[PDB]
C-alpha cells in the first residue's frame, strides 16, 4: 500500500486467464526471499525471468 514499492520476479508462468485470455497468471518469487512466493494476475504479455513492480504484497491472488 503505502509501504515501500516491491519488486518480484517470475520463476514460472502458469497459463492465461481472463474472460478473453487478456490476463496471465504467473508464479513469482519475491526477490528478497525465495521461500516467499505468491501467485499473481498480470495484464501484460509476460515471459520468463522478467521483473515486475508490485505496489503491494498484502494482496494474494489465484484467479479472477
Partner 1 sequence: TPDIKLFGKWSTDDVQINDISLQDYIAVKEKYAKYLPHSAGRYAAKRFRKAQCPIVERLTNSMMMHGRNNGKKLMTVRIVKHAFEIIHLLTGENPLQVLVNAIINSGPREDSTRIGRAGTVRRQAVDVSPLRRVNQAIWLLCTGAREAAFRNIKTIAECLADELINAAKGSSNSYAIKKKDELERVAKSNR
* Binding stretches for RNA (CB under 7 A): 15-16, 19-21, 44-45
CB of 36 to RNA, least distance (A): 28
Identify which of 51, 61, 59 has the alpha carbon closest to the alpha carbon of residue 30.
51
Distance CA 10, CA 32 (A): 13
> Does residue 13 interact with partner 1 by CB under 8 A?
no
> Does residue 21 interact with partner 1 by CB under 8 A?
no
Q: Which three cell numbers stand for residue 56?
A: 503491494
Residues 40-59 that bind partner 1 (CB under 8 A): 40-47, 50-56, 59
Amino acid at each position: 500500500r503505502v509501504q515501500p514499492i516491491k519488486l518480484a520476479r517470475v520463476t514460472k508462468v502458469l497459463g492465461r486467464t481472463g474472460s478473453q485470455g487478456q490476463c496471465t497468471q504467473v508464479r513469482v518469487e519475491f526477490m528478497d526471499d525465495t521461500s516467499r512466493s505468491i501467485i499473481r494476475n498480470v495484464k501484460g504479455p509476460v515471459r520468463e525471468g522478467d521483473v515486475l513492480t508490485l505496489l503491494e504484497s498484502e494482496r494474494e491472488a489465484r484467479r479472477l
